[PDB]
C-alpha cells in the first residue's frame, strides 16, 4: 500500500533483468569473462506482458511496462474489463492468457485458487520460451513445475523474490542459469520502510 510502488518497481526491474540477463552478465564480468554471444537478449517493445492480479501493484506494473511498448493483458476475478481497460490492461479469461504471453507476472494473494496457479498444465499452454516473474507470494508459481519448464526450455527464464520456504532449502531453482532471484526484497526500500 505504502509499499505498492516498491513492489511494482522490483517487478519491473526483474522483467528488464530477464530480457537482458543483466545479473548473469554481471556475474560473468566478475568472473573475468567477456561473453557477448552468450547474452544476446530481447526487446520489451511489442511483447506481451500478462499480469495475473490487477490490484494496486499489478496496475502500477502495467502503466510502467506500457511505457516500454509492452502489450499489457491480464486477469482478475473481481475487476471488470472496462475498469482494467481504463488503465490499459485487456482482460481475458486465463485460458486465453497463457498462449499470448512473452512475460507473466503474478500479483495475487496466496489462496487455494492461486497456489500453483502456474503449474505443469498451465506451462504447457504457454508460448515456448515464456519468462515468469514472482514478486508476490511464494507458491503462486509451483516450484517443481517451474524447474521442469526451465529444464525443457518451455520457460526461458524466471525471476523470483519469494519462495515456498524462505530461505529456500531446495536450491535447484535458485542455482539454475536462467533464474534470477532476491531474498524477498519487494518492500525493502528506505521509502516503504520509512512512512
Q: Which residues are catalytic?
A: 137, 166, 184
Per-residue x/- mask for ligand 9TW, residues 87 to 126, rule CB under 6 A?
A: -------x-------------x--x-xx--x---------
Cβ–Cβ under 8 Å, residues 23 and 48: no
| Strand duo 103-106 + 48-52: pairing | parallel
Q: Which residues pair with 130 in a beta bridge?
A: 155
Residues 6 or more apart in contact with residue 102 via CB below 8 angstroms: 42, 47, 48, 49, 127, 129, 130, 131
Q: Would the annotation count 136 as a binding residue?
A: yes
Our finding on whether 53 is near ligand 9TW (CB under 6 A) is: yes
3-state SS track over 105-144: EECCCCCCCCCCCECHHHHHCCCCCEEEEECCCCCCECHH
Comparison of 69 and 109: residue with beta carbon closer to a copy of itself: 69
Cβ-based nearer residue to a copy of itself, 77 or 183: 183
79 binds, among a copy of itself, ligand 9TW, none (CB under 5 to 8 A by kind): none
Binders in 12-51 for a copy of itself, by CB under 8 A: 12-14, 16-17, 19-20, 22-30, 32-36, 39-46
49 makes contact with ligand 9TW (CB under 6 A): no
Alpha-carbon span 169 to 172, nearest angstrom = 9
Segment near a copy of itself (CB under 8 A); pick from 83-91, 109-117, 146-154, 176-184: 176-184
Angle at which helix 22-30 crosses helix 4-20, to 10 degrees, equals: 60
CB of 160 within 8 A of CB of 185?
no
Distance between start and end Cα atoms, the chain: 11
**Residue 70 lies near ligand 9TW (rule: CB under 6 A):** no
Which partner from the list ligand 9TW, a copy of itself, none does 68 bind, CB cut-off 5 to 8 Å by kind? Answer: a copy of itself
Residue 139 to residue 110: CA distance in whole angstroms:
7
Residues lying near ligand 9TW in the complex (CB under 6 A) = 52-53, 75-77, 94, 108, 111, 113-114, 117
Residues lying near a copy of itself in the complex (CB under 8 A) = 5-6, 9-10, 12-14, 16-17, 19-20, 22-30, 32-36, 39-46, 63-64, 66-69, 166-167, 171, 174-175, 180-185, 188-193
Amino acid at each position: 500500500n505504502g509499499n505498492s510502488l516498491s513492489a511494482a518497481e522490483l517487478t519491473c526491474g526483474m522483467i528488464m533483468c530477464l530480457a537482458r540477463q543483466i545479473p548473469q552478465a554481471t556475474a560473468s564480468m566478475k568472473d573475468g569473462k567477456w561473453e557477448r554471444k552468450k547474452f544476446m537478449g530481447t526487446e520489451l517493445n511489442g511483447k506481451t506482458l500478462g499480469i495475473l492480479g490487477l490490484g494496486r501493484i499489478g496496475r502500477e506494473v502495467a502503466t510502467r511496462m506500457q511505457s516500454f511498448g509492452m502489450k499489457t493483458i491480464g486477469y482478475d476475478p473481481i475487476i471488470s474489463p472496462e475498469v482494467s481497460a481504463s488503465f490499459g490492461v485487456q482482460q481475458l479469461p486465463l485460458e486465453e492468457i497463457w498462449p499470448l504471453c512473452d512475460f507473466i507476472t503474478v500479483h495475487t494473494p496466496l489462496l487455494p485458487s492461486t497456489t500453483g496457479l502456474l503449474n505443469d498444465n498451465t506451462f504447457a499452454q504457454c508460448k515456448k520460451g515464456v519468462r515468469v516473474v514472482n514478486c508476490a507470494r511464494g507458491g503462486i508459481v509451483d516450484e517443481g513445475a517451474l524447474l521442469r519448464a526451465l529444464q525443457s526450455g518451455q520457460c526461458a527464464g524466471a525471476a523470483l523474490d519469494v519462495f515456498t520456504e524462505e530461505p529456500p532449502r531446495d536450491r535447484a531453482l535458485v542455482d539454475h542459469e536462467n533464474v534470477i532471484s532476491c531474498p524477498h526484497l519487494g518492500a525493502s526500500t528506505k521509502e516503504a520502510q520509512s512512512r
